């Protein structure tokens, strides 16, 4: 619905996997604990935009901040 | 369409407006250089959730990143 001037960026999990391996957790663990859908879930491992409201579901779980968990890099 | 379960959470801009204020910048001229419609830039004012596009085209556009414009809070 939006017409952006702005296209260049995309987001990066590499923090979550950073935080999981922190916490001793696999990443099948946080899908089942947050219920995350598959297909989802699916996103994260491919950097492609999930809602904010998941976001905010996986910052709750683990008592994290959206910097701990996402990062904004060029394409 | 995800049935998660984890709900305590909201986005803040916080961040955002001062940033904006460091930059010397209102916020019509973020709304107006990034394209940013007027009830989706309404949302940021409400600390209501946008999709990752605009946020990161907000992102290129200031040369920043999340962390610098979204905080996880309690609702």
Redesign the interface.
Known sequence: ???????????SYNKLWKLLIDRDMKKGELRE?????KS?FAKLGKNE?????????????LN????DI???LPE
């Open positions: 619905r939006e017409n952006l001037y702005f296209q260049g960026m995309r987001v604990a947050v219920g995350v859908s989802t935009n999930v809602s904010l409201t998941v976001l905010l579901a996986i910052c709750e779980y994290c901040d959206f910097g996402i990062e904004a």
